[PDB]
Amino acid sequence: HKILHRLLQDS
Amino acid sequence: HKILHRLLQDS
Amino acid sequence: ALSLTADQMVSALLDAEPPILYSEYSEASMMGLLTNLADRELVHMINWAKRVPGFVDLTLHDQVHLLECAWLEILMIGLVWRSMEHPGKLLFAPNLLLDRNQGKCVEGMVEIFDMLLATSSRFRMMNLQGEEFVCLKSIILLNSGVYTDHIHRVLDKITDTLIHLMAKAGLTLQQQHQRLAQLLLILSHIRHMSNKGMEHLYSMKCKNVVPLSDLLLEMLDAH
Amino acid sequence: ALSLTADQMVSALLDAEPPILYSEYDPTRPFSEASMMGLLTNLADRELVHMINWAKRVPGFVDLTLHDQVHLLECAWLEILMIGLVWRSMEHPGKLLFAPNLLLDRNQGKCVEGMVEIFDMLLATSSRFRMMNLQGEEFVCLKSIILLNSGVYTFDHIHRVLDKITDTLIHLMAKAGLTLQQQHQRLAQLLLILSHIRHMSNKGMEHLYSMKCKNVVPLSDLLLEMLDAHL
Numbered sequence: 001h002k003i004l005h006r007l008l009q010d011s
Numbered sequence: 012h013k014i015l016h017r018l019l020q021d022s
Numbered sequence: 023a024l025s026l027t028a029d030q031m032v033s034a035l036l037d038a039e040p041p042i043l044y045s046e047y048s049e050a051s052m053m054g055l056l057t058n059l060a061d062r063e064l065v066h067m068i069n070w071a072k073r074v075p076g077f078v079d080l081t082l083h084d085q086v087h088l089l090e091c092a093w094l095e096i097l098m099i100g101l102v103w104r105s106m107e108h109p110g111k112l113l114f115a116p117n118l119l120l121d122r123n124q125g126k127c128v129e130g131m132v133e134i135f136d137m138l139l140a141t142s143s144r145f146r147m148m149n150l151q152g153e154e155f156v157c158l159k160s161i162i163l164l165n166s167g168v169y170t171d172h173i174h175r176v177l178d179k180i181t182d183t184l185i186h187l188m189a190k191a192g193l194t195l196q197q198q199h200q201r202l203a204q205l206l207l208i209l210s211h212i213r214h215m216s217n218k219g220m221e222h223l224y225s226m227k228c229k230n231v232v233p234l235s236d237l238l239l240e241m242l243d244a245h
Numbered sequence: 246a247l248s249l250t251a252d253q254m255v256s257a258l259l260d261a262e263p264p265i266l267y268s269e270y271d272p273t274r275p276f277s278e279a280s281m282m283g284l285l286t287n288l289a290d291r292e293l294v295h296m297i298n299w300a301k302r303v304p305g306f307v308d309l310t311l312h313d314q315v316h317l318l319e320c321a322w323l324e325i326l327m328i329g330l331v332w333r334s335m336e337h338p339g340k341l342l343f344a345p346n347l348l349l350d351r352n353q354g355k356c357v358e359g360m361v362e363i364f365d366m367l368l369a370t371s372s373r374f375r376m377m378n379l380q381g382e383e384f385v386c387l388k389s390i391i392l393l394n395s396g397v398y399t400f401d402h403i404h405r406v407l408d409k410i411t412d413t414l415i416h417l418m419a420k421a422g423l424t425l426q427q428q429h430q431r432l433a434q435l436l437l438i439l440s441h442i443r444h445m446s447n448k449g450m451e452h453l454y455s456m457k458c459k460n461v462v463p464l465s466d467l468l469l470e471m472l473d474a475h476l
C-alpha cells in the first residue's frame with residue numbers, strides 16, 4: 001500500500 | 012591503444 | 023480518449039503540462055537542492071500523468087508501474103527541454119542554472135551532466151518544438167515500463183500526433199519519417215541517462231550524503 | 246555509402262550477418278552459477294570477434310576514425326548481442342536460444358544470482374518481436390541503428406546514414422503492403438523497442454560488472470575492456 005498508490009487517487 | 016583499436020584494423 | 027483528433031491530442035498534452043518549479047536562493051548542498059527539487063516535481067508529475075489521455079483507463083497497478091519505471095526519464099527530458107536555449111548549461115530551475123563545471127561539485131555527477139548537455143545540444147540541432155516534446159514525454163510514460171493492447175493503441179495515436187505536427191510544418195513524407203526516427207532514437211539515450219542517474223542516486227542514498235523524501239525513496243527502490 | 250538504394254542497403258546488411266555460434270555447453274555436469282556465467286561469457290567473447298568484423302561491413306562504419314569505431318562498439322556491444330539473442334529466440338516461447346545447443350528458460354536463469362530478472366526482460370522482448378511478426382530485414386536494420394546510434398550523442402555523417410536506414414525500413418513496410426499510417430506506426434513501435442534494449446543492456450552491464458567483481462568468472466581481455474568502457 002504504497003505511497004504512489006494512494007497519491008494516484010486524491011480529490 | 013586498446014585492444015579493440017588494434018582488432019578493428021585486421022583487414 | 024482514442025477518439026481525440028491530432029489537435030485534441032496536442033491541446034490536451036499542452037494543457038496537462040506541469041508547472042516549472044523553483045529552487046532555493048558543496049556536495050551535500052547541491053544534492054540537497056537537486057533532490058528536494060525532484061521530490062516536489064514528482065508530486066506534480068503524478069497529476070500530469072493522470073491527464074495524459076488513456077492513462078487513467080489503466081488499473082492503478084499499471085499506473086504505479088509505468089510511473090516508477092519512467093519517472094527519472096521524465097524529469098530528465100523535462101530538464102533537457104528547459105536547457106535547450108542555454109548551450110552548456112542545465113536549467114534545473116529558473117534560479118538554478120548550472121553550467122557544466124558545477125557538476126564536478128558532486129562525485130560522479132559531471133558525467134551525467136555531459137550526457138544531458140549532449141542531449142540538449144541534440145534538441146537544439148533538431149530544433150525540437152514544444153508540441154513534439156510533450157509527445158515524447160507522454161511516449162516515455164506509456165512506453166518505458168510497458169513490457170515489465172489498449173496502451174499500444176494510445177501510443178499509436180501519439181505517433182499519429184507527431185506525424186500530424188510534422189505534416190503541418192510542411193515536411194515531406196520522407197522528412198516526416200526521418201524526423202520521427204531521429205526523435206525516437208533520442209529516447210534510447212534518455213533511457214541510458216536514467217539508468218546511470220538511478221545508479222548515481224542509489225550510491226548517494228547508501229552514503230548518507232543527503233536526506234531523501236519518502237516518495238523519492240520509493241521511486242528509487244522500484245528500480 | 247549514402248548512394249545505396251533501399252534494397253542495396255538491405256542486401257549489404259543481410260550479407261554482413263554473423264554466424265549463429267555454438268556454446269561449449271558440457272552436459273555431463275549440472276550448472277553452477279560459475280559454469281553458466283563461464284558459458285555465457287565464453288560465447289559472448291566469440292560473438293564479439295564476429296561483431297567487430299560485422300560492424301566494418303555496416304555502410305559508413307569504416308569511414309569513421311578508428312576512435313569513433315571503438316567508441317560506438319564499446320557503447321553498443323551488449324545491446325547488439327542482446328537483440329541478436331532475442332531475434333534467435335523469436336521461435337522459442339519461454340526460451341532463450343543463446344546457441345543451438347544452449348536453450349535456456351527462466352528457471353535456468355535462477356542459477357546465476359540476479360540473472361532471472363534479466364532473462365525475463367529478454368523473454369518479454371522476444372514475445373514483443375513475436376506479436377509484431379518482426380522480419381529479418383527489419384531486424385538487421387534495427388541492429389545497425391543500435392550500432393550507429395547508442396554512442397552517437399557522445400558527440401553528422403552518422404545521421405545521414407541513420408536517415409538512410411529509416412528510408413530503408415519504411416520502404417520495406419511499403420514493400421510488405423502496409424498502409425501509410427501503418428508505416429509510421431510500425432516505424433515507431435520498432436524504434437521504441439530500442440529503449441527496452443538499452444535498458445536491458447544497462448542492467449546486463451551492471452550484472453556482469455558484479456560477476457567480475459565477485460570473481461565468479463574469468464573474463465577475456467576484450468570483454469574486460471568492453472566492460473571497463475562502461476560502473
Ligand SMILES: C[C@]12CC[C@@H]3c4ccc(O)cc4CC[C@H]3[C@@H]1CC[C@@H]2O
Pocket residue numbers: 056057059060063097098100101114134219220222223224226
Ligand atoms: C537523480 C539526480 C538528482 C535529481 C536530478 C534532477 C532533478 C530535477 C530535475 O528536473 C531533473 C533531474 C535530472 C537529473 C537528476 C540527478 C541525476 C543524478 C542525481 O542523483
Ligand SMILES: C[C@]12CC[C@@H]3c4ccc(O)cc4CC[C@H]3[C@@H]1CC[C@@H]2O
Pocket residue numbers: 285286288289292326327329330343363448449450452453454456
Ligand atoms: C552479460 C551477461 C553474460 C553474457 C550474456 C550473453 C552472452 C551471449 C549473447 O550472445 C547474449 C547475451 C545476453 C545476456 C548476457 C548476460 C546478461 C548478464 C550477464 O552478466
